[PDB]
Amino acid sequence: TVAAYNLTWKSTNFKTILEWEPKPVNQVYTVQISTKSGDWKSKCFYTTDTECDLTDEIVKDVKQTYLARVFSYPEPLYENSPEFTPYLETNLGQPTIQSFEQVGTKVNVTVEDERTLVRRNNTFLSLRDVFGKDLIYTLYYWKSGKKTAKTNTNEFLIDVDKGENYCFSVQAVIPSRTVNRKSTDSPVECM
Amino acid sequence: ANAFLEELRPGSLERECKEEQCSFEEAREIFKDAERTKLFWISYSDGDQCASSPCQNGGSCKDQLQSYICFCLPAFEGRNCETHKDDQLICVNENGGCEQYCSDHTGTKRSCRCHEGYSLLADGVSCTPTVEYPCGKIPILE
Amino acid sequence: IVGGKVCPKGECPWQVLLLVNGAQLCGGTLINTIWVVSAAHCFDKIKNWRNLIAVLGEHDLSEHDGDEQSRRVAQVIIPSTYVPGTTNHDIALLRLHQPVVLTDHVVPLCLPERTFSERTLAFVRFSLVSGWGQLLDRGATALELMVLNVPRLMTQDCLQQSRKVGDSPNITEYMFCAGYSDGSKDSCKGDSGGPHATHYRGTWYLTGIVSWGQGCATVGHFGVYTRVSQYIEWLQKLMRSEPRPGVLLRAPFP
Ligand SMILES: CCS(=O)(=O)N[C@H](Cc1c[nH]c2ccccc12)C(=O)N[C@@H](CCC(N)=O)C(=O)NCc1ccc(C(=N)N)cc1
Ligand SMILES: *[C@@H]1O[C@H](CO)[C@@H](O)[C@H](O)[C@H]1O
Ligand SMILES: *[C@@H]1O[C@@H](C)[C@@H](O)[C@@H](O)[C@@H]1O
Ligand SMILES: [Ca+2]
Ligand SMILES: [Ca+2]
Ligand SMILES: [Ca+2]
Ligand SMILES: [Ca+2]
Ligand SMILES: [Ca+2]
Ligand SMILES: [Ca+2]
Ligand SMILES: [Ca+2]
Ligand SMILES: [Ca+2]
Ligand SMILES: [Ca+2]
């Protein structure tokens, strides 16, 4: 057997999957995950895949720091993964502009409060529910010249020239973050 | 899309990209600017990866740029919700729910056992002491 | 024990005190009314094999109470593969001359089955180590039984997370590391033979034996314990065997 390598975390809106190499040849894998003071819990028992979904485990406490390791079978050979702190590292999914209504010389741009994988009382919590004040949305628009706006909610209230048409795009952002601070730009929408 | 003479009319996002599929060039004629056209084209032409209906067992697919995300029903997990949480009753998995010893059984279900001085309860997973001072228990705390 | 606390009287009921010629020798673990598991190296320099005593229900070495029970050690079984002065196969099975009385202060720790221990217990993060050993490396021993909660590590991580030393003993498959490398908490020499007990779903099990390490609570090093799971068969077969003429017995291993 060969120890797995290049263990990488693929997480978006908390959907978290551990991937690694190489494509198993005469060897199966079993994953274990835990917090620095918790017990090791096994996942994806004897899988031949080179991936393992750990979503249900990390959403139990997205602020904890997790460590995972992949065992290799023909103590067994294994490899530790990089530490992973969901709250600080899960990528923000691509946003979606839910709507925008014009009211005279102003426009209200609403951003869809998309859901995450974090369960709570038999429901999925939104990005807002999870990040609260840590989350803001930035707007990048233009009179159909660059313009930008920021909000600590899911809506932008901006001024516009009567008659002219504008196009909008937003991004999810967690200012305090160091890495993966911004989501990709949302689809463009025009009035 | 382009039809006979339509290109004589000014560009229109609604008529060209919404009510029809517009090429990059048609999109470029509407947005004019380079960056703007690109900002629009990345999403417009990405394609809905949820079209395959990859999320199994009643899960819900959420489209993303060149990828998707599956939200699963409580009893499921996995990239595409293909994992049956109820089909993991094996000994290596949380000791199979057994309070003490676990024995696997290919073809059937694992069975639980107990250490000397204990007996397996009717639930088939728990162990209760059959002596006054079983091993591993602390009297002044029991 | 370095950096631990007193084990409230009665909360470490399987802890054993071993004495030779009335002098403190080592710790040990009761696993039934007649057998005690300890460390083999605790007997490297024994001369009067007839003066080995095991005391159960001990707590405060400066005060006698009715929970104490003394028994002569009628037999010390050590693997034929253990070499005095070294570290591998550091385990010993002791037969008490007379069974001890099980009370609220004297209870045996459970010897688990092999696969349960390797597959489940070995992955329980924390376990308890205890003894009347030194409170500091090279310091004085404790008067009251001390206990310490230590985290376990797979050997690969132990090696990677430890300061490589010149001629340190190898960490074999008959061992496992547990503790901290910041020099704050660990078991020590006088704790040898004592239990490394793991709590799992309402019951405590014997997973390790205080064996060795570089000094005590040394920065960049972890405590090393005998991996009891490897001796389950060995122990069970011997507990069913007939007593021998002499005290010391070397039994083959496997
Ligand atoms: C450094 C001498 S030492 O500190 O006494 N360590 C030696 C191993 C040892 C020998 N040479 C070495 C070189 C580098 C690192 C370790 C060693 C060592 O530990 N030797 C054994 C006796 C060997 C025998 N059969 O007589 C010993 O002292 N065991 C008691 C003990 C219990 C717990 C801990 C602990 N948790 N901490 C440490 C020690
Ligand atoms: C649906 O489309 C996605 C695109 O990435 C593909 O990965 C799935 O396998 C398919 O079901
Ligand atoms: C999407 O989410 C999944 C979990 C199920 O609740 C579906 O019914 C829903 O459409
Ligand atoms: Ca057209
Ligand atoms: Ca056209
Ligand atoms: Ca056109
Ligand atoms: Ca229309
Ligand atoms: Ca048309
Ligand atoms: Ca053109
Ligand atoms: Ca054209
Ligand atoms: Ca897409
Ligand atoms: Ca006393």
Side-chain angles (χ1 to χ4, degrees), chain A, chain B residues 1-5 8-13 15 17-18 21-24 27-28 30-34 36-142, chain C:
Chain A
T1 64
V2 168
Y5 60 94
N6 286 337
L7 281 57
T8 305
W9 297 86
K10 294 296 191 299
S11 185
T12 302
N13 290 324
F14 299 106
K15 180 71 181 186
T16 309
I17 304 174
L18 183 70
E19 310 186 327
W20 64 86
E21 297 193 301
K23 309 317 164 193
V25 183
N26 298 178
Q27 64 176 48
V28 303
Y29 304 108
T30 285
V31 179
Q32 287 194 332
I33 186 177
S34 70
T35 47
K36 188 175 175 184
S37 275
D39 299 326
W40 294 94
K41 188 181 184 173
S42 290
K43 303 287 299 188
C44 302
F45 322 105
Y46 311 120
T47 179
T48 59
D49 299 314
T50 55
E51 74 175 52
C52 172
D53 183 35
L54 298 174
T55 296
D56 292 349
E57 300 317 317
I58 63 85
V59 298
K60 288 188 176 184
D61 192 331
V62 306
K63 281 176 178 172
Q64 276 289 304
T65 288
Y66 301 80
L67 187 64
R69 52 191 187 186
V70 181
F71 293 167
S72 291
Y73 306 104
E75 302 183 329
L77 298 182
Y78 69 98
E79 181 62 30
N80 293 321
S81 67
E83 300 195 307
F84 184 71
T85 307
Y87 200 74
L88 304 177
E89 313 177 66
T90 194
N91 299 293
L92 298 165
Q94 174 177 44
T96 299
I97 292 183
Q98 190 180 79
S99 67
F100 45 69
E101 79 183 77
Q102 192 166 180
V103 185
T105 182
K106 294 179 175 296
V107 174
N108 168 53
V109 181
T110 306
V111 181
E112 184 185 302
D113 182 27
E114 193 184 301
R115 56 176 167 177
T116 69
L117 279 292
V118 178
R119 298 176 184 285
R120 183 227 61 185
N121 299 60
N122 196 180
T123 71
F124 286 116
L125 299 185
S126 71
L127 208 73
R128 177 65 65 195
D129 293 313
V130 176
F131 289 107
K133 299 183 176 183
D134 289 323
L135 174 71
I136 73 170
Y137 283 110
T138 64
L139 183 63
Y140 180 80
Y141 63 115
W142 62 73
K143 198 198 309 176
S144 183
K146 303 177 180 182
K147 288 184 172 62
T148 68
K150 299 182 180 189
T151 180
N152 72 311
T153 63
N154 280 54
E155 298 180 303
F156 298 100
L157 196 292
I158 65 181
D159 299 306
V160 287
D161 293 349
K162 182 276 295 179
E164 297 293 300
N165 296 65
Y166 296 64
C167 293
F168 303 97
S169 179
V170 305
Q171 295 181 70
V173 178
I174 304 293
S176 57
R177 280 192 171 188
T178 63
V179 298
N180 305 313
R181 64 186 297 84
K182 306 188 313 173
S183 69
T184 61
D185 300 277
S186 72
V188 178
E189 287 309 301
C190 320
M191 44 186 52
Chain B
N2 296 303
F4 179 65
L5 295 185
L8 272 63
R9 324 178 70 112
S12 179
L13 174 64
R15 182 188 75 244
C17 301
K18 258 55 182 177
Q21 299 193 73
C22 67
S23 72
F24 179 76
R28 198 283 303 167
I30 293 177
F31 292 105
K32 294 183 51 187
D33 181 66
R36 294 178 183 178
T37 302
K38 282 181 53 185
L39 176 60
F40 168 79
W41 194 254
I42 59 181
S43 298
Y44 185 76
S45 64
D46 199 68
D48 171 24
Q49 283 62 53
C50 282
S52 346
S53 290
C55 306
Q56 298 169 52
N57 298 301
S60 299
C61 193
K62 210 301 177 183
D63 185 54
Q64 302 286 312
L65 288 177
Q66 292 287 295
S67 58
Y68 59 92
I69 290 186
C70 291
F71 286 69
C72 314
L73 284 178
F76 297 100
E77 64 190 298
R79 181 190 298 282
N80 297 89
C81 309
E82 72 279 28
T83 302
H84 274 270
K85 296 178 73 68
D86 287 303
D87 290 341
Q88 313 300 300
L89 198 58
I90 51 187
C91 288
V92 295
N93 177 14
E94 292 295 76
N95 204 53
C98 296
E99 176 160 59
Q100 302 194 336
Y101 302 154
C102 187
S103 294
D104 284 304
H105 294 296
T106 51
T108 67
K109 67 179 181 178
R110 66 88 182 86
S111 61
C112 298
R113 291 176 297 104
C114 309
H115 183 296
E116 186 188 307
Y118 294 79
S119 289
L120 185 66
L121 290 182
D123 62 11
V125 304
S126 305
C127 297
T128 195
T130 63
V131 304
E132 169 171 33
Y133 292 108
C135 65
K137 291 289 195 298
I138 301 175
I140 66 178
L141 301 184
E142 293 294 317
Chain C
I1 304 302
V2 174
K5 292 170 164 52
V6 172
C7 184
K9 177 179 166 65
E11 284 175 41
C12 288
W14 33 69
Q15 172 74 50
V16 178
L17 173 58
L18 292 184
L19 306 169
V20 64
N21 303 313
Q24 187 178 311
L25 176 65
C26 277
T29 302
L30 188 72
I31 60 179
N32 64 49
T33 74
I34 301 179
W35 299 93
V36 175
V37 171
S38 183
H41 84 256
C42 284
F43 308 92
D44 280 6
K45 273 93 81 172
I46 301 297
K47 191 188 191 66
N48 307 312
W49 296 89
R50 290 298 177 180
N51 306 335
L52 286 162
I53 296 290
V55 179
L56 280 67
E58 257 305 349
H59 175 67
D60 180 335
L61 307 189
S62 75
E63 172 177 61
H64 288 294
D65 63 32
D67 296 316
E68 309 165 14
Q69 297 183 57
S70 291
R71 296 282 189 283
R72 289 171 174 293
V73 179
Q75 192 170 59
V76 174
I77 312 180
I78 287 176
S80 301
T81 56
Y82 170 79
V83 178
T86 70
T87 50
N88 211 193
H89 300 299
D90 195 5
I91 183 170
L93 181 58
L94 285 48
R95 188 203 299 275
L96 302 190
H97 179 221
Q98 237 62 56
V100 295
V101 181
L102 299 190
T103 71
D104 285 346
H105 298 71
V106 169
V107 175
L109 183 55
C110 302
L111 183 69
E113 294 182 338
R114 182 166 196 150
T115 60
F116 172 57
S117 188
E118 312 182 321
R119 159 201 299 172
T120 301
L121 302 182
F123 299 121
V124 168
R125 184 74 68 170
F126 291 95
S127 291
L128 296 179
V129 298
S130 52
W132 288 277
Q134 299 73 12
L135 296 175
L136 293 172
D137 189 5
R138 295 168 61 176
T141 59
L143 286 173
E144 285 179 289
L145 178 58
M146 310 300 266
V147 65
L148 175 69
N149 204 197
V150 298
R152 177 173 182 169
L153 291 73
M154 281 193 74
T155 301
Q156 175 174 291
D157 292 308
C158 189
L159 296 179
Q160 303 186 333
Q161 293 180 48
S162 295
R163 274 279 301 292
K164 295 293 136 292
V165 179
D167 307 300
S168 67
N170 293 313
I171 300 178
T172 71
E173 70 268 54
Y174 298 105
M175 311 173 188
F176 77 77
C177 307
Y180 307 75
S181 62
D182 62 3
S184 68
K185 297 170 288 295
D186 185 16
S187 55
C188 200
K189 297 185 180 184
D191 300 306
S192 291
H196 165 281
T198 307
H199 197 35
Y200 186 70
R201 293 182 176 176
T203 301
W204 292 85
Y205 303 81
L206 177 65
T207 46
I209 306 171
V210 179
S211 183
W212 65 283
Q214 194 169 318
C216 298
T218 299
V219 169
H221 296 285
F222 292 94
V224 185
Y225 305 73
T226 304
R227 188 181 300 244
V228 175
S229 58
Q230 296 272 45
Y231 304 94
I232 305 296
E233 289 190 357
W234 189 76
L235 296 166
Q236 303 188 314
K237 180 174 184 181
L238 290 169
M239 287 189 282
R240 300 165 195 154
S241 297
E242 299 185 4
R244 292 280 188 168
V247 176
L248 180 57
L249 170 62
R250 272 56 67 86
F253 179 77

